[PDB]
Amino acid sequence: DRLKGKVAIVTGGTLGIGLAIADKFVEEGAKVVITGRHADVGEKAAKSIGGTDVIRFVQHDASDEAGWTKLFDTTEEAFGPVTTVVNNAGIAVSKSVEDTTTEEWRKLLSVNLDGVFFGTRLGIQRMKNKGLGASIINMSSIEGLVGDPTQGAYNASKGAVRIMSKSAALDCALKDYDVRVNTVHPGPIKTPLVDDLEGAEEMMSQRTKTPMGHIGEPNDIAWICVYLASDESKFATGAEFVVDGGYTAQ
Amino acid sequence: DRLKGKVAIVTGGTLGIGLAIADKFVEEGAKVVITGRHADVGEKAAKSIGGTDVIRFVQHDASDEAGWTKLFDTTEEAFGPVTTVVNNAGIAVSKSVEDTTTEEWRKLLSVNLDGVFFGTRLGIQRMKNKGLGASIINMSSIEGLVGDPTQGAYNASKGAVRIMSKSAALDCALKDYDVRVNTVHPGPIKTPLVDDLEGAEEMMSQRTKTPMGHIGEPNDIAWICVYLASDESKFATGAEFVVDGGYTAQ
Amino acid sequence: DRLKGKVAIVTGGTLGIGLAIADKFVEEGAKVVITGRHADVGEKAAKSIGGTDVIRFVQHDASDEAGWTKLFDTTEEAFGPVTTVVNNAGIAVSKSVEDTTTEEWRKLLSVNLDGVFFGTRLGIQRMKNKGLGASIINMSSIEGLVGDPTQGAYNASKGAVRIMSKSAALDCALKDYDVRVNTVHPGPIKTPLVDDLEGAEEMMSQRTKTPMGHIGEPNDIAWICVYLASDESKFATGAEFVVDGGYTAQ
Amino acid sequence: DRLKGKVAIVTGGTLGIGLAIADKFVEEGAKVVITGRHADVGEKAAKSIGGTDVIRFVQHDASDEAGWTKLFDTTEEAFGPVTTVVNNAGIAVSKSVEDTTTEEWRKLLSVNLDGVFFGTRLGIQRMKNKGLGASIINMSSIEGLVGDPTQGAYNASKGAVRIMSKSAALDCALKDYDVRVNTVHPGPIKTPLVDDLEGAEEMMSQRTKTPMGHIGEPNDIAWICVYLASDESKFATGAEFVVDGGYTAQ
Numbered sequence A, B, C, D: 001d002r003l004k005g006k007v008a009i010v011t012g013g014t015l016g017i018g019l020a021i022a023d024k025f026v027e028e029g030a031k032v033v034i035t036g037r038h039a040d041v042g043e044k045a046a047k048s049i050g051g052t053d054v055i056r057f058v059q060h061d062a063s064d065e066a067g068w069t070k071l072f073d074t075t076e077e078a079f080g081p082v083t084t085v086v087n088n089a090g091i092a093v094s095k096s097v098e099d100t101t102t103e104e105w106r107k108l109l110s111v112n113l114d115g116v117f118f119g120t121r122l123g124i125q126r127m128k129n130k131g132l133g134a135s136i137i138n139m140s141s142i143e144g145l146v147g148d149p150t151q152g153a154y155n156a157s158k159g160a161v162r163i164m165s166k167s168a169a170l171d172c173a174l175k176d177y178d179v180r181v182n183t184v185h186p187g188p189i190k191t192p193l194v195d196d197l198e199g200a201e202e203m204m205s206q207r208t209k210t211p212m213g214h215i216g217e218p219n220d221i222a223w224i225c226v227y228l229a230s231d232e233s234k235f236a237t238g239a240e241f242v243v244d245g246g247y248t249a250q
């Protein structure tokens, strides 16, 4: 239906937000390849959504540049030319800037920043000039808009994704590539990332944090991603789509 | 049926953006009342979308405070409790701040700002605490994000709507009203507002203005409004949804 | 003397932030006219900063359009051509959008928005093309950047000032008028406005409001205005200068 | 005068913007250490401003992590505890995201992002809790606010610096460290970086780029840095100070 004919790569599509994006993309008629590092999780995730006629898992670390090439090749062979890239894989580290080790800094940036760069660069290269209505959806966060004292490297990575995506959006638009680039900025969402940080859900559910008084769910981010992947959003590029319970409005 | 059961007021819904919002709202299952000041244009507009079982026209100037209560009463008599208010009526004045007459200032603000205040205030009063999944969508502009040297009063109006809507969203969220408030920021859209302005489409299509090299169409704004009116966006409030061909990304 | 030769109008210059702006403007060599509604308060304020050779009080309500041209005339007759206009007069209303009466809406906007419009429009007309290094400083707020659930009309006015100022800045720059226009966005500041609201300073001093754990002082806003009025800022126009204890960074 | 008793490190302080920051810092009474990679240029730069009692050059690549500790030790041995860190060193690469090689990407980020991280992290460690009125000034750019189609890696780096600085600002504020962190966002400035790229100043001077119709000068950025280093800005933290001729206001 709303994504008829689309062919999407969703990185980190085996749990949490990415899993829900994959789920709703398939529901709307897209063919999907989901990636993650853990093949046990990934093969189960794909089967939980559908058969191999509509979704497949590829084991791939988003920080692995060479694997990105193989990932597009595998997706093309399975489903035809890629039309949609969701750079969603990402990790956190609970450290202030002051307390961030250089190893933590480089590791987080290798996934959250390099991975989004590799996927955006290759997405442009693979999808430009093909009349596909192509769309690159880069997962930022409210932490790409406001700071947090205890996620210094994470803040750096999400602010970089925010503005790098604008550069790509502009170049694709000016060159008539038929590729749009936008960023999505979730507020707190119930995912393993949040579930595995003790007390995170309670802290983020305070009204001083999220005015709605609760955190979101992965489908809240899947539905804005369906909009940005569909041709309904053919005039949206370089823009920031914030789904955050009011977090950044105060 | 993405808007199953919704009951919407769309101000200025007889031409341009508002007409397309009303069109796509009816397509997705909403009952709609459109407003405008010209009864013959408006009755035809309504009938062009559907019968009185799904859409009706009400003559009402958005700057008319007393008429806002009658407009809600009329819509609820027709279709039941209002769930969705799109404050779309608006006008432009091609004057710099320096050259703006006080008459022009007050006239434009009485529509673009007073009207949005009236609809937002009454929408909250009439829709809160009824479990309706209510949504107030306030039409700002890229001109609520950046300035334009020849639309001073318009800039003032669109920046007011931008931040006033955040106040409403926060209060509704904190009080558990089940009412969301967001703003939409179109870039240039082919409408009578633009068509009646000699040279405007040619000017806005320059790559230094809109990187996509063309202006949008009314459905481009309709589809983001369908997203915001639907329960798909139940975690989006107090946020800005920009559909502008890249205008504000550079 | 960083404001050597400057001649400044500071509306609402008899108490609080405006008083300190006037005070530091005189310390830096400017001649200053302060305005306010109450003559006993205003004559005492002017005298508390200096003599009539450097500062004078003029009774003028910023919402009074007719009084604006007389205010420029009086200042120029006293001190020579006006070079600097600080649109600082403003009022607050502690009401949600839902709870705002139309009288309260119109009244607040008549001061906070009309007054800034009147001073900016006249300031451009009377200062352009005279080699004065002219500067218009419009007092917005953090409430021009984020919403507050019980400051609806105030939010509307401060967002309007934010974007209307950009329009003016751009027109002046493109026409080589030698007039810059910028906005200042104070966070909470200890002033009679804040002193009169019982509990406001305690509430705004919580870390979830102001991360520094205390509110600012009027000189905090005076010093950014000195920078903006001086030729040090000859390349700054259309920009937002935020002095807020970290309030909007989280 | 305005920087009495301050002790500043200015990275990349031997040319362009950084040289002028150093020049005005010394004029206002600060002791300054400027860094650069080229020793002959650097010693001449320092001598051009003053003697070793007020300014000294230290050869240091901002991307060199271990050298940062030596740089702080050298500065403190010369002038006493560092109070002020200006992370100004930075490089550009004229490539779209699509055309950026991974080595170009890594190289630019090692200076523009890692260097700002290293200086901010160590600055907090070395200046907190000492009553210095410490200030960390991180040089972003208008390219941290909007995208540029031919500056992909640069855009990423400047957006990272923008939001990473908010994290640090908040942490320092919440912990009462007496350390402030802010970002400066120059528009086009006549410097060797701009001079050495053929067609830079001509293109940036077009009204569609810079509404003032000309680019800035290094002193334009020096003076906002003076304000941010001084105690005049003791209530400013986590904020963005834009000096860009109106570039981002349209």
Ligand SMILES: NC(=O)c1ccc[n+]([C@@H]2O[C@H](COP(=O)([O-])OP(=O)(O)OC[C@H]3O[C@@H](n4cnc5c(N)ncnc54)[C@H](OP(=O)(O)O)[C@@H]3O)[C@@H](O)[C@H]2O)c1
Binding pocket: A011, A012, A013, A014, A015, A016, A017, A018, A035, A036, A037, A038, A039, A041, A042, A060, A061, A062, A063, A088, A089, A090, A091, A111, A139, A140, A141, A142, A185, A186, A187, A188, A189, A190, A191, A192, A193, A194
């Ligand atoms: N949850 C929130 O509140 C929130 C809010 C705003 C933004 N975000 C952003 O949304 C995205 C998804 O977050 P989430 O909360 O859904 O995370 P999550 O629950 O931890 O899920 C992460 C997914 O990414 C995969 N993954 C982890 N590291 C990877 C790597 N190097 N390469 C490829 N895949 C990898 C995981 O699979 P494997 O473990 O098998 O690799 C898993 O499929 C992230 O970019 C995050 O920054 C989240």
Ligand SMILES: NC(=O)c1ccc[n+]([C@@H]2O[C@H](COP(=O)([O-])OP(=O)(O)OC[C@H]3O[C@@H](n4cnc5c(N)ncnc54)[C@H](OP(=O)(O)O)[C@@H]3O)[C@@H](O)[C@H]2O)c1
Binding pocket: B011, B012, B013, B014, B015, B016, B017, B018, B035, B036, B037, B038, B041, B060, B061, B062, B063, B087, B088, B089, B090, B091, B111, B139, B140, B141, B142, B185, B186, B187, B188, B189, B190, B191, B192, B193, B194
């Ligand atoms: N077109 C663009 O490029 C653009 C871009 C950004 C934002 N916007 C915003 O989008 C909204 C719609 O713009 P548009 O371009 O579709 O305008 P448009 O083509 O002029 O259509 C205006 C609609 O509003 C109605 N209307 C005008 N004044 C009214 C009033 N006082 N009370 C009630 N209805 C009124 C008109 O009908 P009657 O004349 O019969 O009353 C018509 O139905 C406006 O808020 C505008 O500021 C437009």
Ligand SMILES: NC(=O)c1ccc[n+]([C@@H]2O[C@H](COP(=O)([O-])OP(=O)(O)OC[C@H]3O[C@@H](n4cnc5c(N)ncnc54)[C@H](OP(=O)(O)O)[C@@H]3O)[C@@H](O)[C@H]2O)c1
Binding pocket: C011, C012, C013, C014, C015, C016, C017, C018, C035, C036, C037, C038, C041, C042, C060, C061, C062, C063, C087, C088, C089, C090, C091, C111, C139, C140, C141, C142, C185, C186, C187, C188, C189, C190, C191, C192, C193, C194
């Ligand atoms: N204090 C804060 O926390 C804060 C934060 C951000 C922004 N602001 C803004 O900064 C500005 C100054 O606020 P403040 O806190 O210093 O206020 P304040 O202490 O109440 O002082 C207001 C000044 O304005 C004058 N005034 C009031 N209404 C006026 C009118 N209609 N025409 C001319 N003068 C008028 C008052 O004199 P009379 O009463 O004698 O007329 C007084 O001199 C306002 O724009 C406010 O919105 C304040």
Ligand SMILES: NC(=O)c1ccc[n+]([C@@H]2O[C@H](COP(=O)([O-])OP(=O)(O)OC[C@H]3O[C@@H](n4cnc5c(N)ncnc54)[C@H](OP(=O)(O)O)[C@@H]3O)[C@@H](O)[C@H]2O)c1
Binding pocket: D011, D012, D013, D014, D015, D016, D017, D018, D035, D036, D037, D038, D041, D060, D061, D062, D063, D088, D089, D090, D091, D111, D139, D140, D141, D142, D185, D186, D187, D188, D189, D190, D191, D192, D193, D194
């Ligand atoms: N110029 C503009 O239009 C503009 C606009 C906005 C922002 N900015 C930003 O402002 C900052 C200064 O730019 P600019 O135009 O003054 O640059 P510039 O004219 O090229 O000067 C750069 C200075 O940094 C030094 N430098 C270069 N690489 C370095 C490294 N790895 N470690 C330490 N020092 C290094 C240079 O000396 P050596 O070569 O000897 O090391 C020189 O002293 C940069 O962060 C830039 O991104 C510039």
Ligand SMILES: [Mg+2]
Binding pocket: A146, A247, A248, A249, A250, C146, C247, C248, C249, C250
């Ligand atoms: Mg906030």
Ligand SMILES: [Mg+2]
Binding pocket: B146, B247, B248, B249, B250, D146, D247, D248, D249, D250
């Ligand atoms: Mg722009």
